[PDB]
Ligand binder design. Structure first.
Ligand SMILES: N[C@@H](Cc1c[nH]c[nH+]1)C(=O)O
Ligand SMILES: [Zn+2]
Length: 257
């Protein structure tokens, strides 16, 4: 299919997805001495309705928390954007060890995991499928997760993993507002890039928060306890699902601050 095996992992991906070696790939290392402070960036505005929370699904290489995306009850606006963007999902990336689970790095520093909160351009497109492949189709807030004290805001999410332990398993996941997962400062870097796994479409305007959020070593352990096999097959823990940083290929990372 594609995955994070060594058989079918990131260094493998370009065979089926040549875009893997494109000019707008993600994640990046953000070099703070190379970032241009853009004064024209507005602040990030998020407004989510907890009722749009829908389902949690074990997707084999990760798990996704999906939201009702039929209307604009939950939206991202401001920042680099003229258009309002519509929440459809959030998910995490993590690695084998606490030393490097993040996707994005800052000045070489590798964090323990990363929260992606994903939105599509409902002003221009009529759906996620249509938006997903357009340069201006998706917005994703990335939040660096730094290992330390346990994070209480994760609780609902972690509690729900026992229901969707094996690949394909899903369950309702309702009444939750994921703006409660975001750090209390909204200062951010932006850049054009891509989905961080196949199909790797260069459709994403990234909003990387400057402030990290906490996670505990044992919270991370829950993520890696999820299984990539289907019920009944031998267990194959989801050890990691983060992709190496990619060449900027000429792009400029802008700072909101
Ligand atoms: N979780 C997917 C979201 C997606 C949008 N379109 C297709 N998939 C991603 O890696 O970026
Ligand atoms: Zn992601």
């Amino acid at each position: 299919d594609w995955g994070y095996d060594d058989k079918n992992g990131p260094e493998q991906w370009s065979k089926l997805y040549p875009i893997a070696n494109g000019n707008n790939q993600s994640p990046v290392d953000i070099k703070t001495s190379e970032t241009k402070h853009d004064t024209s960036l507005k602040p990030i505005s998020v407004s989510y309705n907890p009722a749009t929370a829908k389902e949690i699904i074990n997707v084999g290489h990760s798990f996704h928390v999906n939201f009702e995306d039929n209307d604009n009850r939950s939206v991202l606006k401001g920042g680099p954007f003229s258009d309002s963007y519509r929440l459809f999902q959030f998910h995490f990336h993590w690695g084998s060890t606490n030393e490097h689970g993040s996707e994005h790095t800052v000045d070489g520093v590798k964090y323990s995991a990363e929260l992606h909160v994903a939105h599509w351009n409902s002003a221009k497109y009529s759906s996620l499928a249509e938006a997903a492949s357009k340069a201006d189709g998706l917005a994703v807030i990335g939040v660096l997760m730094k290992v330390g004290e346990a994070n209480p805001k994760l609780q609902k999410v972690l509690d729900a993993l026992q229901a969707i332990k094996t690949k394909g398993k899903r369950a309702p996941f309702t009444n939750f507002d994921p703006s409660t997962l975001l750090p209390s400062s909204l200062d951010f870097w932006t850049y054009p890039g891509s989905l961080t796994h196949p199909p790797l479409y260069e459709s994403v305007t990234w909003i990387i928060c400057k402030e990290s959020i906490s996670v505990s070593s044992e919270q991370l352990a829950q993520f890696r306890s999820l299984l990539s096999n289907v019920e009944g097959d031998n267990a194959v823990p989801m050890q990691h699902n983060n992709r190496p940083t990619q060449p900027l290929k000429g792009r400029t990372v802008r700072a909101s601050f």
